[PDB]
Amino acid sequence: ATQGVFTLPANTRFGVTAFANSSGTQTVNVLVNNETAATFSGQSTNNAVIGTQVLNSGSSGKVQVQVSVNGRPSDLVSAQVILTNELNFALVGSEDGTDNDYNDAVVVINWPLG
Numbered sequence: 001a002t003q004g005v006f007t008l009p010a011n012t013r014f015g016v017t018a019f020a021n022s023s024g025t026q027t028v029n030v031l032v033n034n035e036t037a038a039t040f041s042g043q044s045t046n047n048a049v050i051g052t053q054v055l056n057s058g059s060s061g062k063v064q065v066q067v068s069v070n071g072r073p074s075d076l077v078s079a080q081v082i083l084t085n086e087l088n089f090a091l092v093g094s095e096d097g098t099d100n101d102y103n104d105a106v107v108v109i110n111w112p113l114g
């Protein structure tokens with residue numbers, strides 16, 4: 001199934017943060033309405049924040065996270081969880097190799113902000 005695609009409420013500010021846990025340099029692309037809105041790049045094996053940003057979901061609300069290592073797309077796992085009908089997390093994991101720990105780039109999207 002498709003992973004890393006989320007429908008946010010339109011015209012809403014949201015946070016996106018990426019962590020790295022891999023010897024491979026992680027490239028995280030955040031697409032809003034099918035157009036690239038942010039790009040994070042970095043290497044860490046100790047969960048370092050490789051990028052954090054505030055974005056707007058625009059009129060479509062469609063947010064897509066893509067992860068590539070060595071120009072090859074990582075395998076993604078994702079879900080969205082809502083707490084007290086109000087607090088939203090869109091969660092992405094990714095695997096760039098064979099050990100299947102799926103933490104190589106971890107991406108957290110959260111809203112609302114402010």
Ligand SMILES: *C(=O)C[C@@H]1O[C@@H](C)[C@@H](O)[C@@H](O)[C@@H]1O
Pocket residue numbers: 021022023024045095096097098099100101102104
């Ligand atoms: C490369 O060795 C594979 C890669 O990096 C490792 C340090 C480990 O984090 C593994 O999960 C990742 O796929």
Ligand SMILES: [Ca+2]
Pocket residue numbers: 022094095096097098099100101102103104
């Ligand atoms: Ca891995």
Ligand SMILES: [Ca+2]
Pocket residue numbers: 021022101102103104
């Ligand atoms: Ca890893």
Ligand SMILES: [Ca+2]
Pocket residue numbers: 113114
């Ligand atoms: Ca608040």
